[PDB]
Amino acid sequence: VKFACRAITRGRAEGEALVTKEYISFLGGIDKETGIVKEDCEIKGESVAGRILVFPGGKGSTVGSYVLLNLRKNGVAPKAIINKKTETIIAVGAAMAEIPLVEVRDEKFFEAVKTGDRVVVNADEGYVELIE
């Protein structure tokens, strides 16, 4: 299945799909240099370096436009991020860090995407290709 989403930034990324489930925003959560998720949800302790991150949304979202770039220049940032309801501050950060950001309107994406499989994020077209 390949869904069409609403793209803010462009570019295309290939990585393993990681779903954190909870509403965590870029207020923090990830170590700025180490790229380790220090925030608690379930998959706490791993790195987001070079994989695909899926979030429904994030509480607060008061900050994060700067951290995305810092993580990216460390190489410990996620390749792409898919949201159901994203934030403008996220879009700005993703644009500078070259992190294809797309917003999906259908819940079926979150039902299909589970941590472990492969999702091809094409923000050029605005598409998320789930490749088994």
Curated annotation (Swiss-Prot):
Chemical reaction(s) catalysed: (R)-5-phosphomevalonate = (2E)-3-methyl-5-phosphooxypent-2-enoate + H2O
UniProt KW keywords: Isoprene biosynthesis, Lyase
TM helices/strands, residue ranges: none
GO molecular function: hydro-lyase activity
SUPFAM superfamilies for the chain: LeuD/IlvD-like (SSF52016)
Active site: S61
Keyword Lyase attached: yes
EC number(s) per entry: 4.2.1.182
GO BP terms, alphabetized: isopentenyl diphosphate biosynthetic process, mevalonate pathway
UniProt cross-references to Pfam families, sorted A to Z: AcnX_swivel_put (PF01989)
InterPro entries reported in the protein's UniProt record: PMDh-S-like (IPR012016), PMDh-S-like_dom (IPR002840), PMDh_S (IPR020794)
Keyword Lyase: yes
Pathway(s) annotated for this protein in UniProt: Isoprenoid biosynthesis; isopentenyl diphosphate biosynthesis via mevalonate pathway
Top-level taxon: Archaea
Subunit field text: Heterodimer composed of a large subunit (PMDh-L) and a small subunit (PMDh-S).
Stated family: Belongs to the AcnX type II small subunit family.
Chain's role: Component of a hydro-lyase that catalyzes the dehydration of mevalonate 5-phosphate (MVA5P) to form trans-anhydromevalonate 5-phosphate (tAHMP). Involved in the archaeal mevalonate (MVA) pathway, which provides fundamental precursors for isoprenoid biosynthesis, such as isopentenyl diphosphate (IPP) and dimethylallyl diphosphate (DMAPP).
Protein's name according to its UniProt entry: Phosphomevalonate dehydratase small subunit
Organism: Archaeoglobus fulgidus (strain ATCC 49558 / DSM 4304 / JCM 9628 / NBRC 100126 / VC-16)
Lineage: Archaea, Methanobacteriati, Methanobacteriota, Archaeoglobi, Archaeoglobales
